[PDB]
């Protein structure tokens, strides 16, 4: 089939992603490039990974990390963005 099955974490990862971004709007309020960037990279990230449980881990992890640790929000921004391309729209490694 695919992996776990016909699973769909699409709905999750979309609003999940914004949980981070809406937070990013607060934190990187003087830098409105971050949020649109994360949006942008997600758009050009392969829709499969974005609809997979793995990305749900990434999101739930990095987003909530950035919530607890605003000081390193960017690292999680960095991760989440790289995460998108690392495992999507370039997925030869995995």
């Amino acid at each position: 089939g695919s992996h776990m099955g016909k699973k769909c974490y699409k709905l999750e990862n979309e609003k999940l992603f914004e949980e981070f971004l809406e937070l990013c709007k607060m934190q990187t309020a003087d830098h409105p490039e971050v949020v649109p960037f994360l949006y942008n990279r997600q758009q050009r990230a392969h829709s499969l990974f974005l609809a997979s449980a793995e990305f749900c881990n990434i999101l739930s992890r990095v987003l909530s990390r950035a919530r607890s640790r605003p000081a390193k929000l960017y690292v999680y921004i960095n991760e989440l963005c790289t995460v998108l391309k690392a495992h999507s729209a370039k997925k030869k490694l995995n």
């Binding site: 990187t28 830098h31 490039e33 971050v34 960037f37 000081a71 390193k72 929000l73 960017y74 690292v75 921004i77 960095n78 991760e79 963005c81 790289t82 391309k85 690392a86 370039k90």
Partner: peptide, 18 residues
Amino acid sequence: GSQEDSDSELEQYFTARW
């Protein structure tokens, strides 16, 4: 090798204390 700037891709213009 770096086929993307990855984390530094952000660092280019914005970042925190790090």
